[PDB]
C-alpha cells in the first residue's frame, strides 16, 4: 500500500506517534516519506548484510528477524514480514520501542539526513487531523 501524505499523518496520529518521545507528528511523516516513500512494502538491502523493511524501514540486524541476517537480535520480537503489512500497527509498535532509547529518531538514517532539524511541521499542513 502506498499511503497519501495526509492519510498517513492521520494514521500515525491515531497510532499515538504525535509527540511520542517528544517527536512531533511531522517528524514521523517526514521519516516515512524519505525512508519508504510512504510504501508499506518498501524493502532495501544494505551492504552490511541487513535489510530494512516497511513504512519505517526497520532493520533486520537489530529489530526484526528475517532469517537471513547474521548477528540478528530481533529486539522487537517479530518476523520482518510483519513490517510489510498495509496495517502499520506492527511497524509503529516496533518504532516506539526503537525511539524510546536515547538516540531517539536518529535510528532512522533517511530521517536524520532529510528531516532532522528541518521544518517538519510542513509535512502535516493541509491535513485534516
Amino acid at each position: 500500500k502506498v499511503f497519501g501524505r495526509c492519510e498517513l499523518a492521520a494514521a500515525m496520529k491515531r497510532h499515538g506517534l504525535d509527540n511520542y518521545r517528544g517527536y512531533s507528528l511531522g517528524n514521523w511523516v517526514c521519516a516515512a516519506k524519505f525512508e519508504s516513500n510512504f510504501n508499506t512494502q518498501a524493502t532495501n538491502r544494505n551492504t552490511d548484510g541487513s535489510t530494512d523493511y516497511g513504512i519505517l524501514q526497520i532493520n533486520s540486524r537489530w529489530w526484526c528477524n528475517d532469517g537471513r541476517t547474521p548477528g540478528s537480535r530481533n529486539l522487537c520480537n517479530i518476523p520482518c514480514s510483519a513490517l510489510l503489512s498495509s496495517d502499520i500497527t506492527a511497524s509503529v509498535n516496533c518504532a516506539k520501542k526503537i525511539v524510546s532509547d536515547g538516540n531517539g529518531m536518529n535510528a532512522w538514517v533517511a530521517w536524520r539526513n532529510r528531516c532532522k532539524g528541518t521544518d517538519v511541521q510542513a509535512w502535516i499542513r493541509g491535513c485534516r487531523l
Epitope: 532495501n44 544494505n46 551492504t47 552490511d48 548484510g49 541487513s50 538514517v109 539526513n113
Partner: nanobody
C-alpha cells in the same frame, strides 16, 4: 562533488553492457556509490550499491546478473550487467550518498549527488 558516467546503449537480450561512474569532490572515501534505474512509467529503483569496504547489495531483480565493483582509491565504480533482459531497459543513474558507519543501502533518498544518467535499451 561531480559525477561522470559512461557506457550504456542498445543490446540484444542475453547480452551484456558495462557502465562506469567516476566521482570527484569528496574529501575522503567515506561515502556510498550505487546505480538507480527508472523504467518507463516507473519510479527509480536502486539496483546495486557498494560501500568503501567493497561490500555490495542488490535488488532481487538483478542479483547474480549485475555486479557492482569499486576502485575505492580511484573514486570510481563499475556496473557489469550480464544476461540482460528486456525488463532491464531504463535510464540508469549513478549516485553518491552518505554512508552510515560504513554501510550503504538501496534507498535513493540517501543519495544526494546524481548525474545525467545513461540509457540502456535491451531488445528482445
Amino acid at each position: 562533488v561531480q559525477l561522470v558516467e559512461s557506457g550504456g546503449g542498445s543490446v540484444q537480450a542475453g547480452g551484456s553492457l558495462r557502465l562506469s561512474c567516476a566521482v570527484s569532490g569528496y574529501k575522503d572515501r567515506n561515502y556510498c556509490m550505487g546505480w538507480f534505474r527508472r523504467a518507463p512509467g516507473k519510479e527509480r529503483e536502486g539496483v546495486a550499491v557498494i560501500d568503501s569496504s567493497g561490500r555490495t547489495a542488490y535488488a532481487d531483480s538483478v542479483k547474480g546478473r549485475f555486479t557492482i565493483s569499486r576502485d575505492v582509491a580511484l573514486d570510481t565504480a563499475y556496473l557489469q550487467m550480464n544476461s540482460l533482459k528486456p525488463e532491464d531497459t531504463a535510464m540508469y543513474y549513478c549516485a553518491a550518498g552518505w554512508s552510515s558507519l560504513g554501510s550503504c543501502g538501496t534507498n535513493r533518498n540517501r543519495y544526494n549527488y546524481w548525474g545525467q544518467g545513461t540509457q540502456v535499451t535491451v531488445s528482445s
